[model samples]
Every structure is written in structure tokens, then in C-alpha cells.
Target: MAESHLQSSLITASQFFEIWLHFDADGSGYLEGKELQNLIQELLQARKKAGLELSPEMKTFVDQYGQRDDGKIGIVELAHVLPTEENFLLLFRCQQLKSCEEFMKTWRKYDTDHSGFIETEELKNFLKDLLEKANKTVDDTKLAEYTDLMLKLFDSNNDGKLELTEMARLLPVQENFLLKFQGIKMCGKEFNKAFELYDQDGNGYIDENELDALLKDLCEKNKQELDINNISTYKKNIMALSDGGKLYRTDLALILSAGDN
Candidate 1:
């Protein structure tokens, strides 16, 4: 696959499906012009949130390809214009991986105890850190984003995490992301058993005291001084990417790719 002149390399097949799924809002198998127009609107909204100033080339590209008053892009037009199926497929995949990497970069901060799972106190700290990082404008957006992201791991009973059953039933299309979560567990019993050392009460739930102690111990284990506030600030910036409260699987994938650099 050929890389984009912009900077990053080509997108992938998985991203194609993710973008297709979202843009296929009508649940139709094929996309037409309307979808393309809507996508442009979405891009504009994202640019606004990012406080971006579009360049001349960017403005021209939007005018030529994305200027739809009725907001429709016919399938035939897409075929004649973007043309290559391989091109769209690669571009979509590239986007998906980029988002996923970004999510991971910020998410790692909350797992400060160095435990794979994010507990309540850790989550609270994560949220606090996020607000501080946004500073001026993202407070409202941050809460919604994290809540929705957290909601996905939830079951109807509201366990606040992804368990085996939840993992099994996740949409097959999104299985690509879940695959990396292979050894994950809701409690310390299953995998990453080392976390069990800090689960002092043996009740399977960890609290703030445990979180604090775990951080203290983790620093010792890592042979490094762990700075709580600084790391939290870094984490908040990661959580600020999406406009919506929760990032879609495709977005997560895209952010992941961007996080590489």
C-alpha cells in the first residue's frame, strides 16, 4: 500500500469496516452521496472542536469534494472520484489504528498501580486529572466521553467492567480491538494475578487506600519515582480527543495509530 504524503502510512481493512459501519447509518450495505456529505460535516465539527484553522489546500479539498448543499454524494460519483476500493480500505484502516493507539496512551495512566484493571478510585483520579488538563473548555466533554467509554464495558446489571460473557458477545466487527484484551479480567482471580497482592481485603474489590498503596509499591517494583499529578495531567490530554462522550471503536483504533508518535 502507498503511504499518504501527509505523514502517516496507509490505512487498513479493519478501518474500512469501521468507517463503513458508522457512515452506513441507514444500515444499508452500500454508501451513496448522502453519506459522503455527512462525513464532511462530521469532519468540520471535529475541526471546530480541535480549534483548527483549515489551510488553503484543505479548504479547497472540502470545496471540491465535500461541498454538498443537499449533502449527498452519489455512489457513482464515489466510484468515479475516489475510485479505488483499495484506497478507501487502506485509509479507513489507518484511521482506526490511529485512534486506538491514542486511547491506550491515556488509559495507561489510570492503571497507575501498574495493574491492568482500572478501579473506581483510579477512575475518579483519572477523571480529575482529565479536567485539569482540559483547563479551559473540555470539562463537560470529558465527563461524557469517559462515561460512555466506561459504559461499553458494562453489562445490563452495571458491573462496570467487561467480563467473559460481555467479551464473547461483542459485535464480531469490533472483535479486532477486543482481541488485544485477551488476558483481561474483571477481578484479580483470572489473569494478571500479580494485582492480587494488593487486594488486601480479599473481597475482590480495590479501594482508594489500596490504590495509594499499590502506587507506592508499583514505584518500588518499577524502580522509578511515580509523580501522580504530572502523569494525571498527561492522561487528561489523551481523554480530550473525541467530541462525543465515548469514542467509537473505529475512533479508538484511529487514535491508537496516532499515539505511536
Candidate 2:
């Protein structure tokens, strides 16, 4: 059978999906053990086939996972490691940022209102800056058009705004751990109750240790949607939102609050 991905210069976005579908053959939503190792080896082969030596990032990418013990890979890790361009986040396409932490930093920068949403005009300026930095010029109308199109593309409910994940077409799916937390979210009243319950010391914020226990408990409570081994990752990534390890209730809400905006 002819392999479909060979048709492209590098993996296109569609081909990327196909690659995961093929490699994650168990459909566990992750690539593990031999699956991950073979994928890395083939990626290196694909690069050499393109007549290029390993770039520094490729060297590090190969080094990082090639020897890591677990060798498990999520779709984002595969996207991050693959020999592809404009490949992350279906081509939200920013090279200046990498890592879910950096993407979180970038997301916080644009969601200046802290309303837990990036409103329309705010998204307008971001894409404007996005293009200008690319040395691609745009008139006001074009920038406005870009914003609206992006909104339409990412805004799941036709809302005139973007929630964290919406604007973040922007993270390593690992750090997009935030995305998986969607099902575990709480309604407004429960959010407040749960927030206060976890901030047990009355420090009025959830600190690192507190966050650890909270995440540990969350993974315990939501076995279907969460993994205990990933509790630290969930904590670090979400605490990346906190002020020097102090996750105040408001900020916690950004990660866990459900429907009421």
C-alpha cells in the first residue's frame, strides 16, 4: 500500500492527524513504548530524507524523548516533535513561542482583561501584532477581517469572544491539560465552595502544596477524565497561572469555573 504522507514536503496538518491515527493504533489517545520510539525514528529518517542534518531543536527533541523512560506521547508532543511547519495548533502558527508554559504566558498577555475571555477588539490587536511582527503589513480592514475569521474559526459557540483554549489554539497538548479539565469543571456555586474548601488555611489563595493536594484529589475523584501520574503536570501548568505560586480563587476560576462566563 502506498503511504499517503510521502506526498508532502513535510507533514501537512491533515497528514499529521493521519500519522497519529496510524501510530496511536491502540486508540488510547496516546502513543507509547514502541509506538513512540518508531515514530521518532521515522521522523528522523524523514528529516534525513529531506537532505538535512539535525537542527539544534531536532537534536534536542530527539535527545529528550529518545531516552526518556516512559516514551509516551500525546498528540501535541507528536506535533511538537514532527518534521512539519505551521504544524502546531492547526497552524495558529507562532514560532516565537514554544512550550505550554510559554503559551500560557502568551495567553495571559493577550487576555489582559482577566475576564476569562479575550474579547473581539482585543483579539484584533493581537493578530495585528502577530502580522506586523512577521513583517507582514495589514490595513485596518484586513486586520479586522483576520480577527473575525479567527473568531469564527475558534469560537466554539459563536460567542463574540474567546475562552482560554479558544485563543490558545496555542499550547502543547500536555499543557493544554487545561483543555482536558473542561469536563471536570464546576458551576459557579460549586466553584466558590470548592475553592474555599481547598484553600483550607484561609490564606485566601491556593499555594503550591495546596495545589498539589487539590490536583491529587481531582485526579482521584475524576478517574475517568484524569490520570494520577499527571497530577504534578496539572498543578505546574495551572499554577503557571498563579502569582508566584499563590493561586487565588479568581485565577483558579479561570481554570475551573464552568458556564457562567
Candidate 3:
């Protein structure tokens, strides 16, 4: 007897994260060269097992990754190649938070306590926001299911909470300035002092020159942790968070403050 008729199957969150880990074994945030070759080979094998042929959309993305020729296989295309779950895929598919600046803004909004980690409730609202942005709606159980999955998916330390870097896994790791800035972040007292000292006009915001000076001094003092050579690159990327040229204290705090602020 045949099993009952079907809807297409889906992979679990852990399964999706595992494949992501597998595809970019180097932790490079994306795949190319030998990585792409290895990935396509596996997909080709999967293509055989998972039906003699892939779906048109699937096949198109397969080409987008490899046959399109050295195409950088990113998470979006990676998700494209696989049968992702109904809900977890939404978190990945939503592009509004892809930009580092927006991700930081969202982080600041939801990690409301400034405790540096998002507890379960905060995570729920964050997920709810994403769903809303996608113009979809859900009930409590739907929200709870996603919340539970995220904890298992990213709470690597079993801390029952989502740390900034852990949550940042939602973004492409290569350009995640949050991760890059992690090494040199300031303690609460130190950060506040730095901001106060640097906002020289006392207008409660850091202008471009003030920020330039602040970064230079920060690199000098943290020479062991930060490289002076990368100052320009860091400034350019971090400045993206500022409104026009005015780096308000709150905005700078997102990157520098120890989260106890």
C-alpha cells in the first residue's frame, strides 16, 4: 500500500544549519573554488536521490551556484538549492535585516535592557517583527515554535539566550562588522567616558572629525587588539550607522558599549 498523498517535504532548523556548516566548512561566510565544487557535487548526488531531476527553480539556483560558473554560493542561493522549512526559511528569506546597520538597529531595539543578550521574550518580538515585515501573520504557537527553534539553532553555549554574535549568524558573516568590532569593544564606564570626551562640541553627538579623532585614539590605546592600518576601513564601515555625519552617542554605543550600558 502506498502512503497517503503528499505536500512537499521540509528540512528542520538543525538540519539546515548543519548543511550550512558543511557547505562553508571554512567558516568563510560563503563558498567558492573547492567549496563550490564540493557543494555542487553533493547537490548533484542529492539531485539524483531526491527525484531524478530537480525542480525548475531548484535547477536554476543550482546553475546560479555552479553551472553559472564560479558563482559565489551564498546562503540565499544555498537555501534556494535545498527544501527549507516553512518558518525558519522566513527568517533567512527576510532581507530587511541583511544590512549590518539595520541589524544593529534591530538589536538595539529588541535587546531593550542593554544586557547584551536577547532573552526569549525579546527574541519573540524580533521574530514577530520579521514576519510582519514579510506581511505574514502568526498565532502564539507559531511564534513560540520559531522562538524555540532559534534557541536550539544558535544558542551554542546553552545560555538560554541569544548573544549578539550568535544572533548575527542571520547575516552574512563576512561583512558583519559587529563580529569584527567584538574584539575591541569597551566596558560600560570606558565607553561612556570615550563618547563624552570625543563629542567635543558637547552637543551630545559625534561629528566626523570627532569620530576620526576618537577612532585614532581608540586604536592607539588598544594597539594590541586593533590595527591602526585598518582605521580607514573601520571608519568607513562604522560611519554607516551615523545619521548624516553626526554619530549620536546611542548609535556609537551599539558598537562600542559593553551592553551593560
Candidate 4:
């Protein structure tokens, strides 16, 4: 199970359960591989936005923990795999910004004196801004509790303040996966944007080389450690999704829009 250090003061156990319900569309009291993958993919996007890359092998996180004999995972089993309250907040905050660069720009605004460090008070203001952006209110009591948690987690030097890098960890910018499919309407504009980049050779398809290059770029861009060892597994998954040996533009779009069909 992956662990997240960030904490949020507002997400209660009920809220977490409600979020879980959103993913548990079948209400089977369990999450199967596909349903769990959807949740994991969303987290992976958040992690990458924070410039934190997890191993592709993280796909095993679901199976490793709560998988039953039938390969499905109950909510109790997935309790360990689910996001923490703080993590939920960070993920939402990151998505709102869309990119780490944009997040930093907003962070810098708090440094009105350009002190290069966000004082404890400034940090509260930052949280207020985030809450406002989310159309949520800042509860004084909850905000104070959250601020204390943030200080405890990131105040590495015991300086009672947060530096740029420290602040960045709490606000990651992320984009969703192109292959999530299911309930996703294959939006042509978004599909073309990702496919064009993946189809590196301009041959209108993603071959082994193109796929490798694309993954490599993703890893590098997200500051994730590069390891091509898992490329074979990824290729296998894509091949299964595509009708042909390689992934054509249309096939790619279709696979992204829905399951292999």
C-alpha cells in the first residue's frame, strides 16, 4: 500500500466513505480490478503532478493488499490503499491548478515580501485561498488544525515555516490518464492532444518505439525514476486493448473512450 504524507483537516471518515461510494458503482461492497484501477490512475496523476513518480509496478498495490480469492477487494481490504484526508485535499488542490508550475505561481503570491519562505500565518491564508477556489469555506477551527498538521509534516528543519519545495509537495498538478476508458466519452480534442504526442514518428500510430519514447518522456517529465523493464507489460496491456498489433489513432481513441471492443 502506498502512503501519502500530506494531511487535510476537513475530510471526515464519512466524506471518505462517500468518495469510495462514488468509485464503487456496483455497490458490491467490493472493488474489482477495473474499479480499483480507476481510483489508482487518479492518484497516480496527482502524484506525477507533485513531481513524485511512483513505479508502474504500483499497479500491484491493489492486488497486493486486499484481493480476495475471487480477485476482488472489499472496502475493508482497500482501507489501506485508499487516500488519506490530507491526500484527498492535495489531489483536489493539484487538479485545480492543472500543473505544478501554475501551483507555484499561486504559492508565490503569498510571499508578497519575497521572503522565499511562507510564514505560518501566510500558510493559513494560502489554505483559505484554496478553499475559496474550491467553493468551500474556511472553518477557523479546522483551518488551524490543518495548518498545524502541515507544519508538523513539512517543517523538516524545525524552522516553523514552509519553503518552496515543501509547499510544492502539498500542491501537485496532475492530468488524467488517456487509457482509463469506461464512462469516458472519447473527446476528440483531448484524444488528439495526447495521441499526437505519443505518435512520435508522425506515422499516425504508436509502435513499440513510440510507446517506449512516450513513457520515457512521461517518467522524465514527472521526475520519476526511469525503468524500461516494465515496458513489456505496458505494451501487453495496450496490445490487448488494440485490435491490431500496434495502436492506431482510432483504436487508441476507442480504447480510451471505452474498454477494448
Candidate 5:
């Protein structure tokens, strides 16, 4: 039942590509060691600005993810390290509030008149803080445009003010699907059943073809697609904990829990 959320939790490959492009400064479709190092430094600073700290793994990320012979990382490799949308907001890596509580705190901060909604000026201030927290630089004209757009989207009642519920949509209120499933223990029998379906050769392991087929099926059901590199990286990451080059049933279950773990 909980497993069903995995599909919705994954960032689409296109979304991952946007982040990849941001760091792919040379347009080489890859992140060189120095580029990745710079990215991590920025990520660390951003996280720090939010009163949070990066995991130990993030501090040495270039050497960690830059595993290619040329010491560069590709888009698919980058995907494995990206913060999910839910965390993306909380970390202030992009923009927006950390949670619904923080959202209310900020909303009231701007709604100083004790009004039930935020006026245009107040909304602009809110957005200004969001952009600032994210280290985003925008001119006054663009900031005004952004404020106008936000009002258009969240001013559902068309009162030129944003209500709490309306603003909730823009906040990070829930944990990401991947993080949400951490530490969950699945029924061994059910795990075995699912593993059997993907282990076509019945050899107690899932090879590239079998794993690809399973991933393809999952994506098909979700009306999405993962690039070959992502699939390969997924396979590599999962197989890393296994005794062999392929994935066993336990490895599959562990992989499913890996994001949260």
C-alpha cells in the first residue's frame, strides 16, 4: 500500500534535467569535478542559510558522485543526488517555506494588519523573502512580475489577497515520497512475490534486462519515462549492496527503502 507512493514521489526525468542543466556550466551534458564541487559548496551555503546543515556525504560529494574514469558526473548520476521537491523547498535550495507551520509564521509576518489575507505589497514582501532565502537575484521588475503571478495563482477568490489555504499549495507541507518510506519493513512474502515477477530467469537475481523491464513497466503505469542512464544508475546503486553484480529480492526491497533509509 505504501509502496504505491513511490511512483508519485520520483521527480520526473525532465525535472532532474533542469537541475542538471543548472550545474552543467559548460553545456557538455556533464558535471566536471570542479563544477560538482562548486555545486556542493553552494548547496552547503544554501542549507546553512536555512539554519540546516548538509549531510556529511554532501561535503565530499564531488569525489563521491564523480565516479567516471574522466572524473565527471552525468545527468542520471546527478538525479541520484538531487533533493526531492519537498526537501527542495525546506532546504531553501530553490525557494519557499520549510513547512506549513513555517508558512503560517511567514504569512502572518506579512499579514501584519491581522487581515485574513495578504495584500499585493505584503505578497511581494513574502516573495522577496523567499527569493532571498534561496539566494536568487531578481530585479524589481521581475520581482513585481513574480508577485503578480503568485497573486493570480493563489488569489482564487479574486479578492487581490492570498488566504492561508490558498498559500498552502506553495509551501512544503509534507515529506517527499522517498523520505516518507524510510525505515518501513515490508512483508517478506510480498517482497519475494514482486521480486519473482522481475527475476525472469528465475536465477535469484535481476539483471539489466529484467531490471529495465520492471522500471519501464513502472514508468509506463505512471505515464513517465526514465532515461537509460538513470535506469543504469539505479541498477548500479541497488546492486552495490548485493553480493553479486545483480539484485536479489532483499536488494530490491532495500533499494525501495534506500531513499528513506
Candidate 6:
């Protein structure tokens, strides 16, 4: 049977529902915050084992999907409001940055100091500048609408100034604003730090090969002297090895299983 275009690439309703099974931890129809974390953490670990990387656009779409009002992703919220990938991809189109490279370009262009890192103050200034200019050249109504959303989204402390925590929140996760709020910026500090390490020569960028090298090295060290078939544990060990050869509390509780080689 010939598959439709949507059937091949687009996430079908069945697939979506099947993925939702993660949220139904106890086979209950409802979900909550802890479940969302467990699901994301587990899925991410599994993906790492499989060496699958989400395209930048997809990452961004997931990052902003559902934000917890308290700055995290809630399972019930994610289960209740999974948007069609087609619909969510529309936002990527709206921004004119289709690929991850394009998206990073947008981010880097606004990163005035040339630092690979982005700070909230810088983003606020950039948004303010864009908003002001856009208001002059485009419809005032449209400019105001977007600027308002930006301000509210990035102002974590509500003091009217963008901060590091708020800026990190801009990254995409799957679902919506609620999930975003749940997956706070502060949580992934270790991941970012580890990623930066593989960015050899301080080029501030990492391609697939570099990431693969980094992953392989970590995996070897992790699986050493361990009697387990848990790939998830191997990934947890990689993340740990990435963090200056130290393991955190989360590392101790990490789960691992064998990956398809």
C-alpha cells in the first residue's frame, strides 16, 4: 500500500496516542508533572542510546510546547494538549528558520558579544530593539502582540529584565508552554556543560561526528566494570563523565539497558 505524505513523516494520531502511554504511568487516563519528567528523562535517555538526534526545529518545537505555569512540564497538561506536529511546525515556518542551523543563526545573530552562550539581558535588548524597529516598519498591532509575549515569556522574576533562567527557557521541548515551564533552564546545566567540552578548539559548535565521539568515549568508560544491560545507565554514566568526571545524585539513580548496535 502506498503511504500518504503525512503517513510517512508526520506524527499520526495513533502514534501520538501510543506515545501518550508514557504519561499513563499506572495505566490511568490522567497524567501529572512527575510523570512528564520521568517520561522525558526516560525518552531522552533511550534516544541517546539509539544515537538519534532531533533536528533543531523539532527540538525548538518540543521546548516551547507546554510550559508549566511554575516553569515545568506537567504530564496531564502534555497529555491533554499535544498539538499536531504539522500545526507546531507552523511556528517554525512563521519564524523563517526551518533548520537547526538557521535557528542557531537567528540566536547567534542576536548574540551581540559573540559568546556561544546567550544571556537574558542580551535577548531582552535584542527583542526590544526588534520590537521597536518592527513597530516602525510593520503593523503596530503585530509588533505589540509579539513583544508582549516575549516580555512575559522571558521575564522569569517579573522584574521586567530578562535573566539567565528565563533565557534558557526559550529552548524547545515537546508539547507546550506547560511542559516548558516544567523543564526549567536550570536543570540542564550539566548537559550544556558536557556538550561544550566536545566542542574542541572552543569553536562553540558541535556537529554529529563530534557528538558521536563524545558519546562513544563516555559509553566505554560507563560500561567499564559494570554488569548491566541498561543503555539508560550507560547514558547516565556518559552524562556523568561529561561533567568533569563527577557524578551527581541523579547519576546514582540512573537506569541503563543495552542499546541496539
lDDT tens readout by residue for model 1, 1-261: 111211122222223224434564653223335665565455444445456543444344367657553343222223222222333322223223344334344544554442333345565455555555544333433343433334343322354432211111121213123222221212223213433554667765544444445444433333332334423322332233322332222212221221110
Q: State in Å the error of residue 89, model 2.
A: 7.8
The TM-score of candidate 3 is: 0.59
Q: Which digits, one per residue and each the tens of the lDDT, describe model 5 over residues 132-208? A: 66554544534554455446544535766554332332333242212111222234454456567787786877765
Worst 10 residues of 6 by lDDT: 252-261
Q: Which candidate number has the best TM-score?
A: 3
- The global Cα lDDT (0 to 1) of model 6 is 0.35
Ranking by TM-score: 3, 2, 4, 6, 5, 1
RMSD of every candidate to native, in Å, equals 16.9, 7.4, 7.1, 17.4, 18.8, 15.9
What does the lDDT come to for candidate 3?
0.57
lDDT of each: 0.35, 0.57, 0.57, 0.45, 0.45, 0.35
Clashes of 3: 0
The list of candidate 2 runs beyond 4 A from truth reads 1-91, 128-146, 149-159, 169-175
Which one wins by TM-score: 5 or 6? 6
> Model 2: per-residue lDDT, tens digit, 1-261?
013353245554345556765665654445656766566566566667765555655556677776654655554555545544332233244422556654554544566644445667776656656665545454444445445544653464566665554334334454456556666766667778877889899887779677877777778877666677678877876776565677655546656664233
Candidate 4 per-residue lDDT, tens place, 132-226, comes to: 66555645544555555455444535666654322332333122222122224235565567678887677876775565564455434432222
RMSD in Å for candidate 1, one decimal?
16.9
Question: In candidate 6, how many Å is residue 105 off?
Answer: 1.4
Measured with C-alpha atoms, the lDDT of residue 16 in candidate 5 is 43
Model 5 deviation from native, Cα RMSD in Å: 18.8
